[PDB]
Amino acid sequence: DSFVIRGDEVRQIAPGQTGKIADYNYKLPDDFTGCVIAWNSNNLDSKVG
Amino acid sequence: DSFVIRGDEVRQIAPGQTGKIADYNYKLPDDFTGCVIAWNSNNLDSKVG
């Protein structure tokens, strides 16, 4: 799975965690087997304006 | 004249200013006829690690 979120909302990508992303955007199962790999993408996704 | 500095040192690139960049690195004359251009390069010059 792949998506883009802000830095404060990275922690909501976790099993048994709440937030805007967990409730409304992306919910992990409470018993989840896998890896959450998040890296900063200022150079690729930001632009002036 | 092209160089890379910090964000907080951008205000030191001006005629008649003080600081580390103005005293030790790049000094602008008081009788300056010209333009100062400064753009953010977090995308291209910065690197994680």
UniProtKB/Swiss-Prot annotation, chains A, B:
Source domain of life: Viruses
Known outcome of mutating residue 20 to T: In strain: Gamma/P.1
Effect of residue 8 to N: In strain: Omicron/BA.2, Omicron/BA.2.12.1, Omicron/BA.2.75, Omicron/BA.4, Omicron/BA.5, Omicron/BQ.1.1, Omicron/XBB.1.5, Omicron/EG.5.1; complete loss of interaction with host integrins
Name of the protein in question: Spike protein S1
Recorded consequence of changing residue 11 to S: In strain: Omicron/BA.2, Omicron/BA.2.12.1, Omicron/BA.2.75, Omicron/BA.4, Omicron/BA.5, Omicron/BQ.1.1, Omicron/XBB.1.5, Omicron/EG.5.1
Described purpose of this protein according to its UniProt entry: Attaches the virion to the cell membrane by interacting with host receptor, initiating the infection. The major receptor is host ACE2. When S2/S2' has been cleaved, binding to the receptor triggers direct fusion at the cell membrane. When S2/S2' has not been cleaved, binding to the receptor results in internalization of the virus by endocytosis using host TFRC and GRM2 and leading to fusion of the virion membrane with the host endosomal membrane. Alternatively, may use NRP1/NRP2 and integrin as entry receptors.
Effect of residue 20 to N: In strain: Beta/B.1.351, Omicron/BA.1, Omicron/BA.2, Omicron/BA.2.12.1, Omicron/BA.2.75, Omicron/BA.4, Omicron/BA.5, Omicron/BQ.1.1, Omicron/XBB.1.5, Omicron/EG.5.1; May enhance affinity to human ACE2 receptor
Source organism (scientific name): Severe acute respiratory syndrome coronavirus 2
Region listing for Integrin-binding motif, in residue ranges: 6-8
Complexes and interactors: Binds to host ACE2. RBD also interacts with the N-linked glycan on 'Asn-90' of ACE2. Cleavage of S generates a polybasic C-terminal sequence on S1 that binds to host Neuropilin-1 (NRP1) and Neuropilin-2 (NRP2) receptors. Interacts with host integrin alpha-5/beta-1 (ITGA5:ITGB1) and with ACE2 in complex with integrin alpha-5/beta-1 (ITGA5:ITGB1). May interact via cytoplasmic c-terminus with M protein. May interact (via N-terminus) with host bilirubin and biliverdin, thereby preventing antibody binding to the SARS-CoV-2 spike NTD via an allosteric mechanism.
